[PDB]
A paper describes a structure:
With No Lysine ([name]) kinases are soluble intracelluar serine–threonine kinases noted for their unique active site and their association with familial hyperkalemic hypertension (FHHt). WNKs are activated by osmotic stress in cells and are inhibited by chloride. A model for [name] regulation, then, is the presence of a dimer–monomer equilibrium: the dimer is inactive and binds inhibitory ligands; the monomer is autophosphorylation-competent.
WNK1/E388 ([name]/E314) is noteworthy because it is on the Activation Loop that undergoes large conformational changes upon phosphorylation. Mutation of E314 in the Activation Loop of [name] ([name]/E314Q and [name]/E314A, and the homologous WNK1/E388A) enhanced the rate of autophosphorylation, and reduced chloride sensitivity. To address whether conformational changes induced by the mutations correlate with the effects of PEG400, [name]/SA/E314A and the corresponding WNK1/SA/E388A were crystalized. [name]/SA/E314A crystals were in space group P1, and adopts a unique dimer in which the Activation Loops are swapped. The significance of this domain swapping is unclear. Excluding the Activation Loops, comparisons of uWNK3/SA/E314A, uWNK1/SA, and uWNK1/SA/PEG400 show that uWNK3/SA/E314A is more similar to uWNK1/SA/PEG400 than uWNK1/SA (with r.m.s.d.’s of 0.7 versus 0.85, respectively). Furthermore, the orientations of the 3/10 helix and helix C most resemble WNK1/SA/PEG400. Crystallography of [name]/E314A shows that it exhibits conformational differences at the same loci as observed by PEG400 applied to crystals of WNK1.
Residue numbers in the entry:
A (entry chain A): 130 to 302, 314 to 407
B (entry chain B): 132 to 303, 315 to 407
């Protein structure tokens, strides 16, 4: 495609991708930079993360994750290209390289468009569900463990959506027995997440806004009191789905296929 | 000689609170009391509010009913409990057998080193206690075994596991299942190993690690404390290892430990 100079500041160990000193955004211990895939000439995302004092066992796990993730290709999963261990500044960093998303998250979308029309929520939600089923039906099944409106990215205002922030779950993680530090998850935790997401999209309100501190929310949730937002849901068919998803007893919650086999989500 | 200079009474009337403080912990305070039935003195633990839900209150109530029932030598007796407002805040009151002769922690502090004959006898006893709790029905898991909650009758006496209810009472947007705590018997087998190790080396395990996190890495990575290596008796050393195996299914069971030679006669 035409011609190009490099004038890049760093490159992937594979030599495939180049980093520019053009910072795109600055989150937690993350900093995203603009970059290029020499192979496709397509603009890409160079995520400088930080040191999460990665034990080591987990390092292996991350690598094993990376492989899978790189292999993944779906119309609704922000493609993962590559990752590696680097010493930027003075601290042991992990760098990730992914499909660059340019049109902001649902959240940014919500902050801008203020409210969301039925058609949108219907389509974009379906799109998310599709993505999830894809991840869950991977072999072995991959659990997001962290779906939120701000890591659901949109292709265009008029476009489609895709699930992002792919590995960050593992990456960003008295005396008691080790098995006490064990976090046990399953697919259904993603359904729970999804419902919460749908609700926020539907009400343009963050669930449990009412709450004032962390410990307060704990009570409400563990006691299965729904967020004040829930009541503010207008369409009763939506309300159905939201409820079914956020059911406190995990074994009573809906499944992905069930949501997709729902009427609202029928084509 | 059956006086009633008190400040408070149990709902049942059985127990009376004296206005004399025996200790002041985190969000708790212990005062002296009286089982007017047996006429024996007792500990009256005014706790504090633990931002409790309510479902858990029910659970705790059920737990506590189980507790009132228990009788074993190597367990502090538990008498009564109920909800109360002191000052402006909801508190939970606990009544238990009064232990005045301190803990393993206060014992190591005073005597500096533990004699191996003692260790053999007392550790034997802690195992006996845990076996009793684990064979309750439902099984009772401590979750929070430590040396400053293993009490002794006296320097020439024996051991009783305490801080019984505090596992549940003190604890130890995301789906509720994420708040669930996943413990089993081994969690206590693990915590016992730490108890035994402290006793063997008169050092608090992982005394080394200044940062709390430094400990996380080691534990999660499967690294035994510095003090582990300082265990001079090989038979003791093996037991501690078998207890603090990071793989939960690899750790010994209570039965295993009791069946072992070290713990015998």
């Amino acid at each position: 495609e035409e011609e190009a100079e490099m004038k890049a500041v760093a490159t992937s160990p594979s030599g495939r991708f180049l980093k520019f000193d053009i910072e795109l955004g600055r989150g937690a211990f993350k900093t995203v930079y603009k970059g290029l895939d020499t192979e496709t000439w397509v603009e890409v995302a160079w995520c400088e993360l930080q040191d999460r004092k990665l034990t080591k066992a987990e390092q292996q796990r991350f690598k094993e994750e990376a492989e899978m993730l790189k292999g993944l290709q779906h119309p609704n999963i922000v493609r993962f290209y590559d990752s590696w261990e680097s010493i930027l500044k003075g601290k042991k960093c992990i760098v990730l390289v992914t499909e660059l998303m340019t049109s902001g998250t649902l959240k940014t979308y919500l902050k801008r468009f203020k409210v969301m029309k039925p058609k949108v929520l219907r389509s974009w939600c379906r799109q998310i569900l599709k993505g999830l089923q894809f991840l869950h039906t991977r072999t072995p099944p991959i659990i997001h463990r962290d779906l939120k409106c701000n890591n659901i990215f949109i292709t265009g205002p008029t476009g489609s959506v895709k699930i992002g922030d792919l590995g960050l779950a593992t990456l960003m993680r008295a005396f008691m027995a080790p098995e006490m530090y064990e976090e046990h998850f399953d697919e259904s935790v993603d359904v729970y997440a999804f419902g919460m997401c749908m609700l926020e999209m539907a009400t343009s309100e963050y669930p449990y806004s009412e709450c004032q501190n962390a410990a307060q929310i704990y009570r409400k949730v563990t006691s299965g009191i729904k967020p004040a937002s829930f009541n503010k849901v207008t369409d009763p068919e939506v309300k159905e789905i939201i409820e079914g998803c956020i059911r406190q007893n995990k074994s009573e919650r809906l499944s992905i296929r069930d949501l997709l086999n729902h009427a609202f989500f029928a084509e």
